[PDB]
C-alpha cells in the first residue's frame, strides 16, 4: 500500500483509500501500476471507485476511464464471475452505491456506456439496433435498474433527502427519463387521475358532510329515520374511512421510508401534510364519540388542511406543479426564519405597550392581534385612548409600522423574490422528481398489479454472455438523431 | 434508398425522409450522391429540404448550401419547368412551407440569397443597384411573398399560433420589416388611425346613451316627440348597429381563420373580446325588446368590457403596445392558473369557517366574499361574533392571512415579475408582431382598396429568365452601409 | 467624385459625403488616395469627419488614423492657417460638431491626442511635465473648450437634449471630469450651499407666511400696526419677490435655451418645476389683489409644489442624487403611460357601474374617487346599496379589483422595477451630468465672477506654433499613474 | 534615487516611494536593481512594499515575487536579524500594515507561502507533513498572527471599519477561515450559547417586572413584605444590574475600540443599540428615584430596544445571520434617505394642506400623522369636511397619494431590492465577519480563560533558524485534498 501511495510498481513487484494496495494504486489513478499488479469496510474495488469520484469533469473521466479499464480486466480475469452484481457492506450495488453517494456523471456513463472493443462487448450496457441516416435505434438493457426486488436505481433516486447533492440532477440522463415517460403514460398517469378524482370526491363529500352537520344536543346524536339524516350518517361514515386510510398509507409510508427527524419536514412536507389531515379527523371524531362539542373545532382544520392539502395533486400537473413547489420551499425556509423574527418585533413591541398602558382593552393577546393587524394594512393607528404619555405611546407604534409594516415585510419580500427568480428554473426541474416519486409509489402501493405489469419489459437477449452461455435480459428501445453526426 | 441510407454511390449507380433515393441522399447531406445520381406525402425535394431543417447553425448552412446546388442544378436541368412555384400536399410553396415549419435561418436565406455565379443569376432574389461608397443600393424582389391570392409568406408567418417555435423571429429579416413599414405608414396608419376614432367615439356615443338611459316603465319605451328623447333613440339605433357590426366582423374573423380551441383564447385575445362585447350588446338589445328590466344588466357588461376593451388600439402605439402584450400574458397565464390556486384556499377556509360557526352573516357566499376582503386588505378581521370557539375561529383567520395574503399574493407577485423580467425586451419585440397583424388585417378587410393599391408596388423586371424570356416581377429597394465593407 | 467612389487614384490624377473628390475618398477611408490628391453644406473636412463617425472601434480608429494624417498634412500644407478654429455651417467648431453629433470616442481622441512625431507636436493637446516612477505628471490643454465665448464643448455636452446618444458618455473623460470637480470644489460647491440655504429659508418663510395667514375680510387687508401684522406683510414682501425672482431666472432659462416643446417635459424638468411654481405664486398674488378668496388656493398649489420641489437640491448631493433622477424618470415615462391605462380602466368601470345604479351617491366624480380608493386599499367593498342587480354589481367590482389593483398595479409595480435595475447604475452615472449642468449655470447667471475667475486657469505656453511664433494658451496639470507602464 | 527612478544601473553604482534609492528602485519593480546596489516616513521596504500593493493580479504577483527575493537577501544579508518583527511608524508589523491596507492577495501570500529553495526554508510559513495519496496534511505556523500581544491581524482585521477595501475577503484564505472555525467550536459557540440563554432570561426578567410594574402612587413605592412586592423588587433589582452592564460593556467597548464618529453608525451598529439600551434604563431608573411618573415612558422604550435588539443574537447562527445583516443595511442607507425625503413631501402637503384648511382636526401634528396613515393605506380619504374648496383640497391628496403611496413607496421597494438582490451573496459572506468579530471579543472580555487557553495553540518547532538555532513557534495542521495534483 505504501508503494500504492508513492505510485511505485518496483516496491509493489518486489512485495482514505481502503486498504489492500491494488485499492489504493487505482485510488491514486495509476491505471498501469493495478495492470501490473494484477497480472471491514465491505467496499469491492468499484464501490471504492465509486466513492473516489468528485463529479468533476477530469475526476469523471480518469473514474470512467479507470472502470472501462476494470471492467474489460475482470472480464478478462474471471468471465463466469460476477463483478457488478457484487453488494457493498451496505448491501447496495456499486451503481447503487454511486447513485446514493452523488456521482452524477459516473452514473450517466454506467446508463450510457458501449465498448468499440468486441471482446468488451460483454459488459457494455448501450446498444445501437440500426441506424438508417442520422437517426440511430438504441437499445438500453437497463435491466436490474428498475425493478429489481432487492434495490433499484430508481428508486434509490427517488428516496433521496438532499444530501445527495446532485440528487435531482442524476435522472436527467435518457433511459432514467425515458423510461419515466413510459411508466406514467402508459398506466401511472390514468391511475393518478383517478386518484385525483378520488380524493377530489372525497373532499367535496367530506365538505358536504362538515357543513350540514347537526347542531342540537351534544354529540353523538340519534339516527331518526330520515332521508336527510340517512345522507348525513353515511357521509360521516365514508369521510372518517377515508381519514383511517390517510393514516393508514401515511403511517406506512413513514415505516417503509424510515426517514430522519430533520429529513422530515424538509423532504416530506406532503406526507406530514396528508399523515395532520388523517390525525385531525381522527382527534375529531373520537371527541365526537366522547361526549363533547368540541369536535368540530378538530373537524374543522382537517377539513380546512385537506382543500390546501389537494394543492399536492396540482404537484402532478406540469405547470402547475413548479408553481407548487414554490409554497413547498417558502413554508420551509423563508415564512419560518421570518416568521420568527417577525415573533421578536412583534413580542417586543407588544410587551412594549401593553407596560405602557395601565388600565381590559390591553391584553398581550389582544394587543398582538392588534399591532399584528398593522402588518395587514387593516391596524387602526388610532387604537385605544386609556393610556396616558400620547407621544411615548405613538412613537412606539410609528417604530413599529416603520419597522415590521415597512422596513421587514418589504424586505422579506424582497427575499422571496430571491427565492422565485432562483427557482424559476430549478423547481421547473424540480417537478419532475416528484414525477418520479409519484411513479414509484404507484408501484409501491400496488404491488400486485407492478410485478406482473413488468412496465420497463420488452426483454432483448444479450447474447452471448463473457460465460459464453446465451442469456436474456430486459431491454428498452430509444432514437437518437443526429444530424451532426451524419 | 438502402444505397442512400449508406451514402454508397457505388450501389446506388448499380441501381424518416420520404421514400426516392435522391430524397434520401439529398437529406442525408450527400451533395456529391445527388448530383452523381441526378447526372403519398405530396412534398418535392425542396418541400423535404424544409421539413429537413433543425433551425442550427450547421443545419441552416448545411441545408441552404444544398439548396443552393438544387436551384442551380434545376435551372441546369430545366430552364423552363418551375422549380419553387411548385406547391407540396398542403399547397404551400416550399418557402411557404418553411415558414409555416419554422425555418427561421432558410427564409431569411430566401429572402436574401443572392449568386455570385452569373448562370446562377437565374433564380436569385436580392439583388444591387449601385454603390457609391460604403452605401449600397440594394434590391428585393418579393413580388409573390407579399401578395399572391393563392398563399402570402406575409399571410403564414401572420396566422400562427406560436406552435410554430420562432414564427415572431422570421420576419426579422430585412424585407419583411421594410415592407411592413412601407405599408403601415404609407396608408395603414391612417386608417388605423381612422378606425381609432371611429370606435373612440363609438364608445362614446354607447357610454353618453348608457348614461343616460332611460327608466320609466318597463322597457322598449315609447319614443316621446322631445329634443332628449330623440338624442336616446339615436344613440341606441347608432350603439346597436355598431354591435352587429363588431358581431359580424369577429364572426368572420372566426371563419375565415378557423381557429382551433386550445389556440383560440392563446392567440385571439383580442378577437374574443370584440366578440364577447358584441354578444352582450346583442343579448342587451334582446332582453330590452324581450319586455325585461334585466337589460342592463347585459348592457353594462358590455360598455365595461368596451372600454377596457379599448386596449386594444394602444397595442396600435409603440411603448405603449409592450404595455398591453403584458396584460395579454398575465390573464392568460399567470391570473388563471394562480386563480384557481386561491379558489382552493379561499374555498377551504370558507367551508371551514361556515361549518365552524353555528347561528346569517355566515352564508358562503357572504363569508367568501368577507374572506376575499382580506386580500386586498380591506377584510374586518373582527369578522362576526355569534360563533363559539373564538380561539379556534381566530388560528382560522390568521392561518388564512399568513397563507393567502403574505405567502401567496407575495409569491404570485414574485411570479408575475419574472413574466415581466423575461418579456421588457420580448413582448417588445412581439409589438411589431400585433403590428404586421393589424396591416394585414387592413388589407383583409379592405380588400377592393389593396389589390388596387399595390403598396409593395415597385414592378421591375427580372431581366433574362433561365428560358431566356424577359420577364418582369415586383421589386422594393433597399439602402445598406456598410462602412465595414467599403 | 466618381473616382473617390471606385478608389481610383488613376483617373483622380487624371483630373453622402460632400460633393468635393478629396472629402469623398476620405470618407471612403482612402488615406493614400487623399495624399497623393492633395499633394452648401458648410461642413469642411474635419467636419465631415466628424459626422462620418460611427462610435464603433474600427469606424473610431480609421477616423482618429485619418484626422491624425490631415491634421499632419496640413500643418505641412500651411501652419499659419487655422485647421481646428474653422467652423462649420452651424458655426460649430469641427470638436463641437463631434461633440454635438454623438462621437465618444473621437471626442476623446481630440482630448487626449499627442504626438510622437515632434514635428506633429505643433497641434498635440496632451503633454507630459515629467515621470518619477509609474507615476507620470501629465498636461492637458483644453484652452478653448471650457470658456470660448462664442461656443464651448462644456456648454453643449450640457445643453444635450439626449438626442445626441452617448451624450452622457462624452465628459467621462479624464480632462472634462476632472475640470468638473475642479469648477465644483472650487467655488461652485460652496456657492450651491449657499443657494441651497437661501431657498430652504426662502421654503421656510414662504410656509410660516402661509400657515399663519390672516383670514378675516375678503383680500386684501388693512396693514394694522401690530408685531404679527408687520411679520406677515413682510413675509408676504419676501415670499412674492422670490416668486417673481423663479419666474425670471426661469423664462430667461426658457429663452437663452430656446427649447423644443417636445424636449421640454423630457429633459428640463426641475426648470417646468421651479417655473409652475413661480408661476402658481403668481396667479395667487394677483387673485389676492383682485378681490377674491380662490388666492390661497393657488398659494396652496406653489407651496406644495416647493417643498416637493425642493427634491432638486438632493440632485446636488451624489447618493440623493441618484434617488432623485429615479423620480425625475418614473413621473415622465411610467407613470404616465400607466395613468393614461388606469384612466382607460377606472373610466370603464366607473361609467359601467353608475349606469347600473338609479335612484346621489351615484355621481361620475363620486363613483370614480369611490373605485380610486380600492387601489389604495381603502375602498369599502360595501359601497352602496340603492342599486338593484347585486350580483351584477358586485361582479364589477371584483372585476376591477382583480384588475386594477392585482393584476395592472402589480404589473406597473413590475415595470418600475424594470426600471430602478436597469438604472441603478445608469442613473449613479447621470448625476454627474447634472453636477455638470449646475456647475455651469453658476457660470452662466454668475457672468460676471466666471470670466474674471478663470476657473480652468493655468495658462501654461503651448511653446513654438507651426508658424513658429511663441505663444501661450491655458492648462491643466494631471497625475497619471500606472505601474503597469513603468 | 533619480537614478532608481530612470532604472539605471549605472549612475547607481557610480554613487510618492520613500526617500532611498533602493526603495524607490524596488518600488519601480527593478529586482536585478535593487540585487546590484544591496550587493521620518517610519516604513521599511518590507512596509513601503506592502503600501505599494495594488491588489491586482501584476502587481500582487510584482510584489509577491520582490518580497520573495527581499526574504532570500535578507536571510542571506543578515541571518540573526529580524526582518518581519520590525516595526512601522504605526507599530504595525509589514504583514499587520499590509492587514490594514487592503492586500488581500498579499496576505495570503504571506499565509500561504513556502520555499522550494531549502535556505529560504528559514523564512518559510507553509509546511507538509506528509501526502499519502492526493491529500496532503499541511502546516500553517500563524504562531503570532493569532495571539501576540502587541497586535494580531486577526484583529486588525476585525477592528475595521470598512474603509479598507477588500477587508472582509482578507480572512477566507486557509488559516484564518480554519482557525476561525477552531477558537468558535472548540469555546466560543458554547459560550456564546450562555450568552445567548443569559441574555434571553434577562429581556424575559426585564419584561415580567415591567409588565406587572405597580401603579399605586408615585415613585418609588414602600416595599411590603408580601410574596409578589418581593418577587417585583428581586426583578427590578436584576433588571437594572443588568443595565449597568451593558454600560458597562459599552463604555469598555468604545473606549477600546476608540472609533471615530463616522465609522460609529456605519460599522458599531449592534453596539450603540445595546448602549441605548441601558442607557434608556438609566434615565428610567433615575426618573423612578427622581419622583417622576415619566419613568415608565423611558423603561418602556428599552424594554421595546431590547427585545428588537435581541436579533444580534440571530447573528450568531448562519441562516439567520444573513437576514439580520439585511435589517443593519437598510436602516442605514435606504430608510435614511429615503425617510428624509418622504420627509420632504410630508411636510410639504401637510403645510399645504393646513394652510388650505380654515376653522381643530387640523393641526400639522394630526395632519402630518394623518396624511402618514395614507402609506399605510390605512388613511381615510374623507378627512374633515371643515374646510373650503373641495376639488383644491382633494387634488392635493390625490397628489399625495400617487406621488408618496405609489410613486415613490413602491421605488423605495425597488432599491430596497436592489439591495437584497446585490446582498444575497454578499451579506452571506459578511455572516463570517461578525462570526469573527464575536470570536475576538470573546477572547476580549474574557482576557483570563483566553491567553492561558492557547486556542491556536499546537506549538510546532519550525527547528533550523537562519541564526542556526533550534527554536519553536505555534503551528496548527490542515488537510488539503487534490486529486487534480495527484
Ligand atoms: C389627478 C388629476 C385630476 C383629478 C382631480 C379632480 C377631482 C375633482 C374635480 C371635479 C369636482 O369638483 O368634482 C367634485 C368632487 O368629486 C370627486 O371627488 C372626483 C374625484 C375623482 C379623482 C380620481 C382620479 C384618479 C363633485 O362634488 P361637488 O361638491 O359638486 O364639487
Ligand atoms: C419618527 C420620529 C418621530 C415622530 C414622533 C413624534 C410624534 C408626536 C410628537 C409631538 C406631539 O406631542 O404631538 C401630539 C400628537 O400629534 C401627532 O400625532 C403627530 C404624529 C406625526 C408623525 C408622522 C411622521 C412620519 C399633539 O397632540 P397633543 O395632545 O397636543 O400632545
Given at each position: 500500500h505504501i508503494a500504492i501511495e508513492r505510485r511505485n510498481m518496483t516496491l509493489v513487484t518486489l512485495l482514505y483509500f481502503g486498504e489492500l494496495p491494488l485499492s489504493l494504486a487505482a485510488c491514486t489513478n495509476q491505471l498501469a501500476i493495478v495492470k501490473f499488479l494484477l497480472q471491514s469496510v465491505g467496499n469491492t474495488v468499484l464501490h471504492a471507485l465509486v466513492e473516489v469520484a468528485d463529479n468533476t469533469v477530469d475526476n469523471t473521466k480518469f473514474v470512467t476511464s479507470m472502470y472501462n479499464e476494470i471492467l474489460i480486466l475482470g472480464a478478462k480475469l474471471h468471465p463466469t464471475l460476477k463483478l457488478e452484481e457484487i453488494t457493498n457492506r451496505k448491501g447496495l450495488t456499486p451503481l447503487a452505491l454511486a447513485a446514493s453517494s452523488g456521482k452524477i456523471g459516473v452514473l450517466a456513463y454506467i446508463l450510457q456506456r458501449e465498448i468499440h472493443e468486441p471482446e468488451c462487448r460483454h459488459l457494455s450496457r448501450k446498444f445501437t439496433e440500426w441506424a438508417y441516416g442520422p437517426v440511430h435505434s438504441s437499445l438500453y438493457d437497463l435491466s436490474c435498474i428498475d425493478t429489481c426486488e432487492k434495490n433499484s436505481v430508481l428508486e434509490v433516486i427517488a428516496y433521496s433527502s438532499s444530501e445527495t447533492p446532485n440528487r435531482h440532477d442524476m435522472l436527467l440522463v435518457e433511459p432514467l427519463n425515458r423510461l419515466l415517460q413510459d411508466k406514467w403514460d402508459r398506466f401511472v398517469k390514468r391511475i393518478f387521475y383517478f386518484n385525483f378524482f378520488v380524493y377530489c370526491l372525497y373532499m367535496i363529500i367530506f365538505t358536504a358532510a362538515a357543513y350540514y352537520r347537526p347542531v342540537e344536543?351534544?354529540?353523538?346524536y340519534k339516527l331518526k329515520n330520515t332521508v336527510g339524516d340517512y345522507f348525513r350518517v353515511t357521509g360521516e361514515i365514508l369521510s372518517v374511512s377515508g381519514g383511517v386510510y390517510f393514516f393508514f398509507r401515511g403511517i406506512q409510508y413513514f415505516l417503509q421510508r424510515r426517514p430522519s427527524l430533520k429529513s422530515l419536514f424538509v423532504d416530506s412536507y406532503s406526507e406530514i401534510l396528508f399523515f395532520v389531515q388523517s390525525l385531525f379527523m381522527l382527534v375529531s371524531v373520537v371527541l365526537y364519540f366522547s361526549?363533547?362539542?368540541?369536535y368540530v373545532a378538530s373537524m374543522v382544520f382537517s377539513l380546512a388542511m385537506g382543500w390546501t392539502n389537494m394543492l399536492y395533486y396540482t404537484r402532478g400537473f406540469q405547470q402547475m406543479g413548479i408553481y407548487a413547489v414554490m409554497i413547498e420551499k417558502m413554508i420551509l425556509r423563508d415564512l419560518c426564519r421570518f416568521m420568527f423574527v417577525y415573533l421578536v418585533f412583534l413580542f417586543g413591541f407588544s410587551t412594549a405597550v401593553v407596560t405602557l398602558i395601565e388600565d381590559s382593552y390591553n391584553s398581550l393577546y389582544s394587543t398582538c392581534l392588534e399591532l399584528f393587524k398593522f402588518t395587514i394594512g387593516m391596524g387602526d393607528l388610532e387604537f385605544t385612548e386609556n393610556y396616558d404619555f400620547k407621544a411615548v405611546f405613538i412613537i412606539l407604534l410609528l417604530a413599529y409600522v416603520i419597522l415590521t409594516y415597512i422596513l421587514l415585510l418589504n424586505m422579506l419580500i424582497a427575499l422571496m423574490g430571491e427565492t422565485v427568480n432562483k427557482i424559476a428554473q430549478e423547481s421547473k426541474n424540480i417537478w419532475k422528481l416528484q414525477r418520479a416519486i409519484t411513479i414509484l409509489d404507484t408501484e409501491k402501493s400496488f404491488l400486485k398489479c407492478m410485478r406482473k405489469a413488468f412496465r420497463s419489459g420488452k426483454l432483448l437477449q444479450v447474447g452471448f454472455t463473457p460465460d459464453g452461455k446465451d442469456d436474456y435480459r430486459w431491454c428498452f428501445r430509444v432514437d437518437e438523431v443526429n444530424w451532426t453526426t451524419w
Open positions: 344536543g351534544l354529540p353523538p361526549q363533547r362539542k368540541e
